[PDB]
Amino acid sequence: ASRVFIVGGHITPFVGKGSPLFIDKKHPDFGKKKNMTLEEILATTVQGTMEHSGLSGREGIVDQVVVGNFLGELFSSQGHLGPAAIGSLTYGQAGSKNPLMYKPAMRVEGAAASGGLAVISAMNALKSGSADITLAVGVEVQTTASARVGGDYLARAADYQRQRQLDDFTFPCLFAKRMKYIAEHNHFTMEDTARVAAKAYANGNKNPLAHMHTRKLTFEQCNGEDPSNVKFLGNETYKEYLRMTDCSQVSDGGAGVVLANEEGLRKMGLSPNDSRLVEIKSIACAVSNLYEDPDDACCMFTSRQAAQKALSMANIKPSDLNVAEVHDCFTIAEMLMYEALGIAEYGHAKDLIRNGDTTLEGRIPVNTGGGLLSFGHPVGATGIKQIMEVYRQMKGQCEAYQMKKIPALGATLNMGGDDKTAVSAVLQNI
């Protein structure tokens, strides 16, 4: 009966407009250097993952690689990222020896759950006899298209035929539509969602990897007291329910993790009690119907299903959790995710955000490094960044945002589209 261990991994800085690392007209190197391409990010990410996992010089003992990516075929005109991953170890050195040659690889995809799906696929290979050491890397580049062209691409997450007509920013508009229903049922408020953003940015300010690291926002600004915090939607039914600060960033970046089973650890010279490890006690995936939406906007049924499956499988309750990473593609989502995960009861995420319970000094800190709101959302990377952020907290590696009490139990909740795909894992510190 075969356990799965996080051995190590790597998260790149997440970059886009508003980051000093993002090269644009404004930037000292505009004209001299360029932002990384997807290929370069995938290269930096696979290499970093191998390095931080003790695999440098022995990359050949990895059995297989899975890539999570949503829109590479659109933003970067590039699909078929498996062989891209296979050429990533020695990218840009012609004819170099390549220990990864001929190993199995593929790209998996389920909108913003694509990294989460890459981890589950790697885990099935670990439990199946196919692999003892797997690499799961997630990468995304989205800064190559205008905001509106980008919006149309991200609508690939939605039921395009049915929902694209709502707004050029289809996917935001779907969360603004939830917020309307949520406000109508007094489930929570736009002040509450502002408090989520306040928290995300304050955390991001302590994370040099975060897209919005350098951006400071007060609750007041996040609540709409700032002329630049615009209600940008075109759809007049939903316009008033979503501010710029309520939305995740359009970022580029990657995250990688090495996952091993007990034979994998043996091959690396490691024991299962090794203090650099974290055990994935469980992982579960739930998918609903792309074509049909539940009436109750105040419940993410699919994400609730995934979390309840993961916790049950690991035999714990949400109150046992010491830390969580959840899918705050909007502030609206973070609130819904506290309830989906079960750290708050239905209609009570608001108590949590009012009382500070999910802040860095709260009793259940969530998205300690900034979340998708401030850390950023390079779509395919996000599912794997969530795992590595729990890992990093457990190993005491988060520096200015390190939790004071090293967490014993953590949970991840990764969602694709409008709660249509959900992946949730339970992690146990070793």
Mapping DSSP to helix (H, G, I), strand (E, B) and coil, where does residue 212 land? Answer: coil
Mapping DSSP to helix (H, G, I), strand (E, B) and coil, where does residue 85 land? Answer: helix
46 forms part of the interface with Cl ion (CB under 5 A): no
144 forms part of the interface with its own copies (CB under 8 A): no
Which residue in the set 74, 89, 111, 426 belongs to the binding site for Cl ion (CB under 5 A)?
111
Answer yes or no: is 148 a known binding residue: yes
Q: Tell me how far, at minimum, the Cβ of 366 lies from its own copies, in Å.
A: 24
Q: Tell me how far, at minimum, the Cβ of 222 lies from its own copies, in Å.
A: 29
255 forms part of the interface with Cl ion (CB under 5 A): no
Contacts of residue 228, Cβ cutoff 8 Å, sequence gap at least 6: 244
- 162: part of which helix (H) or strand (E)? helix 160-163
Residues 148-177 that bind its own copies (CB under 8 A): 152, 155-161, 164
d(CA 189, CA 236): 19
d(CA 285, CA 269): 32
d(CA 38, CA 23): 15
Answer yes or no: is 17 a known binding residue: yes
346 forms part of the interface with its own copies (CB under 8 A): no
Which span sits near its own copies by CB under 8 A: 96-104, 331-339, 343-351, 361-369?
Answer: 96-104
Task: Answer positive or negative: Cα dihedral of 393, 395, 398, 404.
Answer: positive
d(CA 70, CA 300): 21
Q: Which is nearer to its own copies, 192 or 418 (CB)?
A: 418
The count of chain residues that interact with its own copies, using the rule CB under 8 A, is: 70
Strands 64-68 and 133-140: parallel
Q: Which does 83 bind (CB under 5 to 8 A by kind): Cl ion, its own copies, none?
A: its own copies
Which residue in the set 44, 47, 121, 205 belongs to the binding site for its own copies (CB under 8 A)?
121
Which stretches of 205-276 are DSSP H helices? 219-222, 262-268
* Burial category of 181 from C-beta neighbours within 10 Å (exposed 0-12, middle 13-18, buried 19 and up): middle
Q: Tell me how far, at minimum, the Cβ of 43 lies from its own copies, in Å.
A: 10
Which residue in the set 70, 201, 375, 391 belongs to the binding site for its own copies (CB under 8 A)?
70
Answer yes or no: is 377 a known binding residue: yes
Annotated binding site for acetyl-CoA: 17, 148, 248, 327, 377
Contact residues: Cl ion, CB under 5 A: 111-112, 157, 416-417
